Assembly symmetry: C4
Homo-oligomer: 220 residues x 4
C-alpha cells in the first residue's frame, strides 16, 4: 500500500483504463477481419502484423498490472484467468490462436459477462444428464464399431469414427439417406440399432431442455 502501489492501482481501476482496452479489442477485432483480405494484406501487410504485436504488448502490460493490483485474487477471477490465458495463448495455426484475443470483448464488456454467466450457470445442473449421455454414446460407439466397422470403415472403423457418426445421427444430419439406408444394404437389421438410438438420444435432449426450463422456474 505504498505510494507506488496506489499509483498503478488508481490507473488500473480507472474507467479510462478499461475503455482503452475495450477500444483496443474492438480495433484489433476489426483489423483481424481485414487481415482476411489477400487484397488488403498485399498492401497494408506490415501495418497489421506489428499492430497485433503492439496490442499483445499492451495486453501483457495490462495483464501484469491487473496482477499487481489484485495478486492472488486475480487468479481467483475467471474473467482474469480467461484474459490471462487468452493473452498467453496469443503469445506462446500460430496466427489462428491470436484471434482468441477478441474473446476478451466478452470479458471486458460487462453486459456480456452478464449473458455469459447466465448461460454457464445452467451447465452444472446438466452434468448428471451429460454424464449419462456420454456413457450412452460410449457404449453405442463400441457396439457400432464392431457391428459395422468392418464393411463400413469410413464411418465406424475406429471408436472415434463411430463417435463422430453417432453424434451425426444425433443431429439427424443425413442419418437415413446418408448412413442407415446404406448400412441396410448390407446389414438389413441396422434399423434396430439406430432408431432406438435416435429415440433415446432424442428423448434425453428433450428432457434436458425441460429440466433447464423448470430449474429456472424454481427461481420464479
Amino acid at each position: 500500500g505504498s505510494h507506488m502501489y496506489l499509483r498503478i492501482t488508481n490507473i488500473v481501476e480507472s474507467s479510462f483504463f478499461t475503455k482503452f482496452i475495450i477500444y483496443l479489442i474492438v480495433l484489433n477485432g476489426i483489423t483481424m477481419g481485414l487481415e482476411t483480405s489477400k487484397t488488403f494484406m498485399q498492401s497494408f501487410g506490415v501495418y497489421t502484423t506489428l499492430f497485433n504485436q503492439i496490442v499483445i504488448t499492451i495486453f501483457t502490460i495490462e495483464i501484469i498490472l491487473r496482477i499487481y493490483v489484485h495478486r492472488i485474487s486475480f487468479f481467483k477471477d475467471p474473467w482474469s484467468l480467461f484474459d490471462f490465458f487468452v493473452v498467453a495463448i496469443s503469445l506462446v495455426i500460430r496466427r489462428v490462436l491470436r484471434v482468441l484475443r477478441l474473446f476478451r470483448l466478452v470479458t471486458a464488456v460487462p453486459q456480456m459477462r452478464k449473458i455469459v454467466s447466465a448461460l454457464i450457470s445452467v451447465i452444472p445442473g446438466m452434468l448428471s444428464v451429460i454424464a449419462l449421455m456420454t456413457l450412452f454414446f460410449y457404449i453405442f460407439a463400441i457396439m457400432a464399431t464392431q457391428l459395422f466397422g468392418e464393411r463400413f470403415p469410413e464411418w465406424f472403423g475406429t471408436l472415434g469414427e463411430s463417435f463422430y457418426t453417432l453424434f451425426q445421427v444425433m443431429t439427424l444430419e443425413s442419418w437415413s439417406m446418408g448412413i442407415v439406408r446404406p448400412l441396410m444394404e448390407v446389414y438389413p437389421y441396422a434399423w434396430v440399432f439406430f432408431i432406438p438410438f435416435i429415440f433415446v438420444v432424442t428423448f434425453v435432449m428433450i428432457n434436458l431442455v425441460v429440466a433447464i426450463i423448470v430449474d429456472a422456474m424454481a427461481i420464479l
Copy 2:
C-alpha cells in the same frame, strides 16, 4: 382545425376509408399472384400494370391524407412509417419491390398488428444474446477463413463465405456429410473446430428460447 381540415379528417378517420384500403390491399394481393402466370399475363397484361399504378396512386393519396390529419404524429407511428416507406419503396427487381405493398395487410388489419407486436416485443430482450452470438460467429468466421479457406475456397474463401457456411452448420444442414466430413479428408482435426462450434451455438439457441419463455412468465 378549419372546416377544410375537419373535412378530410372525418374521411380519413372513417371506418369506410380503412375498409377501402384493406379491400384494395387484398385485391392487389390477389392480382399480384395472378401476374405470376405467363398464361394470364399473355392475356390480361395491360389490365394489371395500370391496376398497380392505380393502387399506388390511391395509396399515395391515402398516405398523404394520413400525414395531414396527423402531421408529426404520423412519423412517430411505426405502422404509418412502415406504410409510408412500403408505398415509397413501391414508387422509387423493380417489379419485386411492388409486392411489399401486401405487407400493409399486416398494418391495416389490427389482429395482425396485435400478433406482430407480440413477436417484436420479444426482440429487445434477446439483443444481449444476439450480440454475443454475432461476436461469436465473427470470431469463428475469421478462424475458419484462415484455417480452411485455402484448400476450400467455395465454403471459406472470403469472410462472408465462412459466415454463410457457419450459419449453415448452425442450421445443421448437411453440416457433416456436406462440409465437415469433406474438410476432414484434408484437415483431419477439423472436427475439433466444428463440434465445439455446434455445441456452443446450439446451447445458446436453447437458452435463448428458455429465456423467451421465462421472460414471458415474469408477466404471469
Copy 3:
C-alpha cells in the same frame, strides 16, 4: 319414444354395441395391414374384399342407428360427423380411402378422443399467427417465383413451386446445399432473400410454441 325407438336406443347406447364396433375396427385395421402383402393377397384375396364390404355394411347400419337415436344431435357431434363422412368416404385411389375407416378407432376409443381434443383445443389460439405466417409465405412465394423462377423453373417456376420450396426451406431440409447455394451460382445475392426468410419463419415458429406453452399456463 315408442316401444320401437327405445328398442334400438337401448341397443345402440349399450356397452356391447360400442365394444362390437371397436372390435371390428381393430380387426379391419389388422386385415388392411395384411392386404399389403402380395403374398397374402395371392392366397386369401377374396376373403378380405368381402370382409371390407361386410364391415362397411355394419358401419353403415351402425351409422344409421346412431342417427335415429340422436337425429339432429348426431349432426352436432364432431365424432359422429367424422364417423359419418369416414364411412361415407369409404363408400363413395378407391382402395386408399377405405383405410380412413381405421381413424374411427380414435372416435370409438375415448382415451383417444381425450388426447385428440387436447391437441385440437390448441389450434384456435394459433390461427392469428398461422394467418400472418401464410400471408408471409404468399408474399415471399410471389417474390421468389419472379426473382428465381426463370433460371430455376423446377423449384420456383409456378407460384405453388415457390410455395413448396419455401416450405422446404422452412423445414431447413437441404436449404443451403440443395437450394440456396445453387441459386447463388447464378444470383449471388439470393442469400439476402433466404437467410432473412429463415430468421423470420424460424422466430415465428419459436414464438408460436412459446405461446402454446404459456396459453396452457394461464390455465395453471
Copy 4:
C-alpha cells in the same frame, strides 16, 4: 436369518462390495473400448477375453448373492432385474451383447439411477399420445405402401418400408430432396400426402413436449 445368511448379507450390503462392482464395471468399460483396436487385440488378445469371463463370473457370483439376501424382493427391483438380465444376456453378435454389461454403471452409480428415473417417470404420461401417434403411422404407412410402393419399392414396397420412410420424413431427413420431390416426378400430387403428414406429426411432437413441460409444472 442364520449365522450363514447374515455372513453373506453383511458382505453384500457392504459399501466395499458395491465399490468393487463399480470399480470392475469401469475397468471392463475401459477394456472393452481397447478391444476395439486391432492393434491392441493383436498383442493383448488373450488378456482381455479371459478378463471378460472373469468379470461375468464375478457378476454372476454377485447377482446370485443379491438374490439370496433379497430373494423375491430382488425380482421386484428393476435395477436388479436389469442387472440380472444384462448379466444373463452377456452369458447366453455374440461379442456385442457383452458390452451391455456397461449399462450396469447406471444401475450401480446412484446419481445415474436418479437421472434415469427422472426420465422414465415422464414416459407413462406420454403413452396416450404415443398410442395415437403409432396408430397414425400405421394408417399412413398403409396408404403410402399402396399409393407409392409400386413405382417406388425401395422406400414403400413393404409395410415396414413405408414405416421407416415415414419415420424418416418425421425426422425431416431429406424428406423433400430425397423422397417427396422424386415421388412427385411420377405422382405429382404426393405433396398432398406428405405436407399434411408432416404438419400432423410435427404438431403432435410439439404438443407432447408442451405436455411434458406442463405435467412437470403441476408438481411446482
